[PDB]
Design an enzyme around this catalytic site. Structure first.
Site, PDB file in Angstrom:
ATOM      1  N   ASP A  15      18.585  18.790  -1.279  1.00 14.94           N
ATOM      2  CA  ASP A  15      19.175  20.796  -2.263  1.00 14.94           C
ATOM      3  C   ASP A  15      17.836  21.472  -1.747  1.00 14.94           C
ATOM      4  O   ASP A  15      17.091  21.272  -1.330  1.00 14.94           O
ATOM      5  CB  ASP A  15      19.232  19.871  -3.322  1.00 14.94           C
ATOM      6  CG  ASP A  15      19.916  21.178  -4.314  1.00 14.94           C
ATOM      7  OD1 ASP A  15      20.317  22.088  -3.306  1.00 14.94           O
ATOM      8  OD2 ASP A  15      19.262  21.540  -5.554  1.00 14.94           O
ATOM      9  N   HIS A  32      22.250  25.027   6.134  1.00 13.29           N
ATOM     10  CA  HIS A  32      22.863  23.581   6.260  1.00 13.29           C
ATOM     11  C   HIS A  32      22.708  23.056   7.493  1.00 13.29           C
ATOM     12  O   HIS A  32      22.142  21.687   7.660  1.00 13.29           O
ATOM     13  CB  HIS A  32      24.343  23.108   6.112  1.00 13.29           C
ATOM     14  CG  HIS A  32      24.245  23.896   4.639  1.00 13.29           C
ATOM     15  ND1 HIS A  32      25.722  24.417   3.758  1.00 13.29           N
ATOM     16  CD2 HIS A  32      23.900  23.348   2.814  1.00 13.29           C
ATOM     17  CE1 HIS A  32      25.931  24.830   2.419  1.00 13.29           C
ATOM     18  NE2 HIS A  32      25.091  23.650   2.408  1.00 13.29           N
ATOM     19  N   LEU A 126      16.495   0.780  10.834  1.00 11.89           N
ATOM     20  CA  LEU A 126      17.183   0.746   9.013  1.00 11.89           C
ATOM     21  C   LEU A 126      18.491   1.324   8.835  1.00 11.89           C
ATOM     22  O   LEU A 126      19.193   1.318   9.705  1.00 11.89           O
ATOM     23  CB  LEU A 126      16.483   2.054   9.712  1.00 11.89           C
ATOM     24  CG  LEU A 126      17.354   3.355   8.390  1.00 11.89           C
ATOM     25  CD1 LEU A 126      16.311   3.135   7.835  1.00 11.89           C
ATOM     26  CD2 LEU A 126      16.678   5.190   8.526  1.00 11.89           C
TER      27      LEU A 126
HETATM   28  C1  LIG Z   1      23.465  15.842   8.861  1.00 14.09           C
HETATM   29  C2  LIG Z   1      24.094  15.664   8.273  1.00 14.09           C
HETATM   30  C3  LIG Z   1      24.872  14.521   7.722  1.00 14.09           C
HETATM   31  C4  LIG Z   1      23.762  16.248   6.432  1.00 14.09           C
HETATM   32  C5  LIG Z   1      22.655  17.457   6.617  1.00 14.09           C
HETATM   33  C6  LIG Z   1      23.443  18.912   6.291  1.00 14.09           C
HETATM   34  C7  LIG Z   1      23.267  19.044   4.556  1.00 14.09           C
HETATM   35  C8  LIG Z   1      21.709  19.817   4.142  1.00 14.09           C
HETATM   36  C9  LIG Z   1      23.666  18.128   3.860  1.00 14.09           C
HETATM   37  C10 LIG Z   1      23.715  18.597   2.318  1.00 14.09           C
HETATM   38  C11 LIG Z   1      23.766  19.960   1.827  1.00 14.09           C
HETATM   39  C12 LIG Z   1      24.429  20.198   0.607  1.00 14.09           C
HETATM   40  C13 LIG Z   1      26.010  19.902  -0.083  1.00 14.09           C
HETATM   41  C14 LIG Z   1      23.304  20.683  -0.516  1.00 14.09           C
HETATM   42  C15 LIG Z   1      22.755  21.294  -1.924  1.00 14.09           C
HETATM   43  S1  LIG Z   1      21.794  22.547  -0.174  1.00 14.09           S
HETATM   44  P1  LIG Z   1      22.929  23.544  -1.825  1.00 14.09           P
HETATM   45  O1  LIG Z   1      23.922  24.036  -0.509  1.00 14.09           O
HETATM   46  O2  LIG Z   1      23.175  23.020  -3.266  1.00 14.09           O
HETATM   47  O3  LIG Z   1      21.335  24.530  -1.215  1.00 14.09           O
HETATM   48  P2  LIG Z   1      20.896  25.616  -3.021  1.00 14.09           P
HETATM   49  O4  LIG Z   1      21.018  25.100  -4.475  1.00 14.09           O
HETATM   50  O5  LIG Z   1      22.130  26.862  -3.275  1.00 14.09           O
HETATM   51  O6  LIG Z   1      20.136  26.511  -3.117  1.00 14.09           O
HETATM   52 MG   LIG Z   2      21.943  23.074  -4.794  1.00 18.52          MG
END
Ligand SMILES: CC(C)=CCC/C(C)=C/CC/C(C)=C/CSP(=O)(O)OP(=O)(O)O
Ligand SMILES: [Mg+2]
Ligand SMILES: CC(C)=CCC/C(C)=C/CC/C(C)=C/CSP(=O)(O)OP(=O)(O)O
Ligand SMILES: [Mg+2]
Lengths: 229, 229
Positions: A15, A32, A126
């Protein structure tokens, strides 16, 4: 090379991407994309430190309610990551698995997932689990449905269902149990991630944002685990 | 009087009694007895601050493997607490419920539990849930068995089982969801406590030992929750 500080299976709630981008005046999608670089870095660190399994919360089943455009950009990033990293995962002896309800994804994405799991299915290093369209309660329910069928079929009696039996039907039951959950971004919640599986796991929360999570940060969580006394 | 900082349901992992007693050269049982005083104090604080439900992890289903004598002393403390606090719980409009597998307890204890729940069953203020011989996985499995029966009976199709339906069959489904989990004692684990139910709960860990947990400590966890941004 025995698991860094004896930690076999690490799970991460990645996150903080939105906030990381917003702090710089950029949109969430920019964050992202930078989160994908942190994913590369965490995967390399795990495979080089004897970790047996790394499980990443990449798309919660509740993220479908985010802005249509942010969701599409996420799906394209997933496609892009599969197209772009799978050859290296394979060369590195990493076995790729996607956990969650993939039936909800678009064709192109479903095909790439199935292809990428096939190619690496016989790898022995892994195991990388990407939780996409995943929720902990959903996971338990899928196992419950599997046992419900057996009851329907007359092959199982309600009184026979116990913890061990349901345990053999939730995601990742074939791997070592989750030892450590890391959540970046500052929030202190599990947000419906691996509920059944994290029963005895150490939980490590850091204010560091996912895009900035690096090798030193991961070693710090491992040191925290080693001192789980 | 609206729930302290808007927190409706607090759950607590009351750990640290053994260490608290050991630091003073005393046996664990001495610490468990002082933990009963912290229970009194937490209950009073919750009932006076508008909290709707307080759920306390008093005896994990894995504690049966502790020293025979420590287990017996725990059971006598439970009996003693029922005999000694129930009248006050009732006068304070607190509804008492024990969650966990009570079939494993001795007669005297089972009877006192059933009697104490009956007497306070119609109370409308704080609901106090004492998790005794409780485990999160066990809890989910009990609900699964309830649905498995319905399948056996031909009253339910496997494809009909979903999250909401299992949710209506785990402990405490009739109360507000757990908002905040507090774990005293310094360990950062959930140790098989309310797994299904803590999906969206804030988690608050403190090094303070359970016997020393006081009103200021509880207010601090509430402030932490209020700032759960
Ligand atoms: C290549 C791969 C498979 C994955 C990488 C992409 C990523 C980082 C995915 C997780 C994204 C999400 C839905 C994140 C919580 S960040 P958030 O958008 O909740 O951000 P915030 O809480 O608002 O600060
Ligand atoms: Mg978040
Ligand atoms: C009146 C009532 C219903 C409950 C109060 C009694 C208490 C405090 C029960 C919880 C006791 C247990 C099994 C605690 C973990 S402390 P621990 O023994 O694990 O201590 P330690 O980790 O070794 O330091
Ligand atoms: Mg303990």
């Amino acid at each position: 090379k025995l698991p860094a500080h004896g930690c076999r299976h690490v799970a991460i709630i990645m996150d903080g991407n939105g906030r990381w981008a917003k702090k710089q005046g950029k949109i969430r999608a920019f964050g992202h994309k930078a989160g994908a670089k942190s994913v590369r870095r965490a995967v390399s660190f795990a495979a080089n430190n004897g970790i047996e399994a790394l499980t990443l919360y990449a798309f919660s089943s509740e993220n479908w309610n985010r802005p249509a455009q942010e969701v599409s950009a996420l799906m394209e990033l997933f496609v892009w990551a599969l197209d772009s990293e799978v050859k290296s995962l394979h060369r590195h002896n990493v076995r790729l698995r996607i956990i969650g309800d993939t039936s909800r994804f678009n064709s192109r994405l479903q095909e790439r997932i199935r292809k990428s799991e096939a190619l690496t299915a016989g790898n022995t290093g892994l195991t990388l689990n990407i939780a996409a369209n995943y929720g902990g309660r959903w996971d338990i329910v899928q196992g419950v449905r599997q046992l419900a069928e057996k009851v329907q079929q007359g092959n199982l009696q309600p009184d026979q269902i116990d913890e061990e039996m349901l345990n053999q039907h939730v995601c990742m039951h074939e791997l070592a149990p989750v030892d450590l959950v890391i959540r970046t971004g500052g929030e202190h919640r599990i947000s419906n991630f691996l509920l059944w599986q994290i029963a005895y796991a150490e939980l490590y929360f850091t204010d560091v944002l996912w895009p900035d999570f690096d090798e030193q940060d991961f070693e710090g969580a491992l040191n925290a685990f080693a001192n789980r006394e």
